[PDB]
Amino acid sequence: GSEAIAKYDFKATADDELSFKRGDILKVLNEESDQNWYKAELNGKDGFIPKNYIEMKPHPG
Ligand SMILES: [Cl-]
Ligand SMILES: [Cl-]
């Protein structure tokens, strides 16, 4: 899994989507995907998140 920070509030509008707030750290499950939706987990929930809403955690420095 890879961490990513939410850059905007996102509200799920389908049952398979995962809501989150700006600042939340999501765990992205299939970062290697070339799709514009990722699968992620946050605070015990999971679902699809939009790729362009998040910033992947880089290596420090
Ligand atoms: Cl949700
Ligand atoms: Cl590190």
Side-chain angles (χ1 to χ4, degrees):
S2 320
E3 288 172 345
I5 185 171
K7 294 197 307 178
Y8 325 92
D9 284 8
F10 171 72
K11 186 185 158 163
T13 49
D15 286 314
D16 62 346
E17 292 165 19
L18 177 64
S19 301
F20 51 83
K21 287 275 141 36
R22 176 177 48 83
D24 289 354
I25 301 296
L26 298 120
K27 175 181 175 194
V28 178
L29 308 178
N30 55 344
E31 170 181 12
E32 67 278 8
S33 171
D34 52 330
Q35 300 311 325
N36 283 336
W37 289 84
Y38 288 144
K39 298 170 184 173
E41 293 173 345
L42 174 65
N43 296 309
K45 282 176 186 57
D46 62 68
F48 291 107
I49 66 164
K51 171 205 228 269
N52 61 20
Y53 270 58
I54 71 174
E55 170 176 16
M56 296 303 308
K57 174 161 69 66
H59 186 260

